[PDB]
Design a protein around this ligand. Structure first.
Ligand SMILES: NC(=O)c1ccc[n+]([C@@H]2O[C@H](COP(=O)([O-])OP(=O)(O)OC[C@H]3O[C@@H](n4cnc5c(N)ncnc54)[C@H](OP(=O)(O)O)[C@@H]3O)[C@@H](O)[C@H]2O)c1
Length: 353
């Protein structure tokens, strides 16, 4: 009786995908577009998803560099998230999932026309739209880290770095919803306008106005929470800008990922003493350590998105040098775009019919 997509599997036999062929943080050096790869088949507990959008993530280049498990050698698949239609599935999976259903997921190997996804990690979505993909990593990271670690409450002051980017946009909005005063950093006046449209109380274009100075002058008593994703000298300023009982959440350090080690140097020598003297913290956050909170987060985010209560800005690359990010080949360009700092919102690549 049940359609498991077996006809599809017969006829949809080969596909394109991206493959890490050499470890490097230079994505173009590391990754090759492969063709006429077999379409993988789903196991009893799996879905086979035809990706229609895939997300571009800063750590894509950490992945390509082998930094998640240095002992794992090429070749391996890449891309952290996708959205599309179920084309086939295993028998067990069919209890809860159906051929043609719109699903989104966070699992490695999304940079492919088709990806096998365990049905246990799939998220049902209303339809295949790029706004929902924005939630999977970027939204959930901001949601869970702030909920679990931010201690947010009315009137607290929150500094968000890369605030106009994929995760930053949600850290901004979610802090505003908690009635915080929100400061955001970005690299252009048009990004600052975007931030202002999300409710940012103090956008800062760091290219034209020094962040440290603004913080010293406008926030002399400091900030309560920092959503820190840049690293380096920005991390150092953030530590100095903490209020008493302040918390710096280490979300990432993109300023370092292109470097050979992937790290951005910081002034750490006096950090324990600084933290003691302010009763302040530096707090790491890795989304994969918080998967017990993921399904709830995703559900709330999805409700806010569909209801119009959350801006989910998507950058499909229409304004990039070679235009809209269409096809797996465009992933190279999109990663470049990210590392040139040109995106507003979440970078997404379309894989259309
Ligand atoms: N901990 C976690 O589980 C987790 C999950 C998701 C993301 N993250 C982290 O969140 C951060 C943002 O990632 P994303 O994927 O959302 O990208 P994104 O913010 O959409 O794009 C990156 C942004 O970083 C700034 N930038 C780019 N290159 C830079 C450089 N070399 N030095 C300083 N700033 C640079 C740019 O914004 P400006 O105009 O502001 O410069 C750019 O638009 C990354 O650190 C990432 O690792 C962490």
């Amino acid at each position: 009786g049940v359609d498991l997509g077996t006809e599809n599997l017969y006829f949809q036999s080969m596909m394109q995908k991206l493959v890490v062929t050499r470890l490097s943080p230079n994505f173009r050096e590391a990754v090759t577009l492969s063709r006429d790869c077999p379409v993988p088949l789903p196991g009893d507990g799996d879905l086979l998803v035809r990706n229609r959008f895939v997300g571009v993530n800063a750590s894509d280049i950490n992945y390509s560099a082998g930094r998640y498990d240095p002992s794992v050698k090429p070749p391996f698949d890449i891309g952290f998230e996708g959205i599309g239609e179920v084309v086939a599935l295993g028998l067990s999976a069919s209890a809860r999932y159906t051929v043609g259903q719109a699903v989104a997921y966070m699992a490695p190997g999304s940079f492919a026309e088709y990806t096998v996804v365990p049905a246990s990690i799939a998220t049902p979505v209303p339809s295949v739209k790029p706004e929902y993909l924005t939630l999977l990593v970027s939204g959930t990271t901001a949601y869970i880290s702030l909920k679990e670690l931010g201690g947010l409450s009315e009137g607290k002051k929150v500094l968000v770095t890369a605030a106009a980017g994929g995760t930053g946009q949600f850290a901004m909005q979610l802090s505003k919803k908690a009635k915080c005063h929100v400061i955001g950093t970005c690299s252009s006046d048009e990004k600052s306008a975007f931030l202002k449209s999300l409710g940012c109380d103090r956008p800062i274009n760091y290219k034209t106005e020094p962040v440290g100075t603004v913080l010293k002058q406008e926030y002399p008593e400091g900030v309560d929470v920092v959503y820190e994703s840049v690293g380096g000298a920005m991390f150092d300023l953030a530590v100095d800008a903490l209020a008493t009982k302040g918390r710096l959440i280490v979300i990432g350090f993109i300023s370092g990922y292109q470097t050979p080690t992937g790290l951005s140097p910081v002034k750490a020598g006096t950090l324990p003493a600084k933290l003691l003297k302010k009763s302040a913290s530096v707090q790491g956050f890795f989304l994969n350590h918080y998967l017990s909170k993921y399904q709830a987060a995703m559900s709330h985010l999805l409700e806010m998105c569909v209801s119009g209560d959350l801006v989910c800005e998507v950058d499909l690359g229409d304004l990039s040098p070679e235009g809209r990010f269409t096809g797996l080949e465009s992933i190279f360009r999109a990663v470049n775009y990210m590392y040139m700092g040109k995106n507003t919102g979440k970078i997404v690549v379309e894989l259309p019919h």
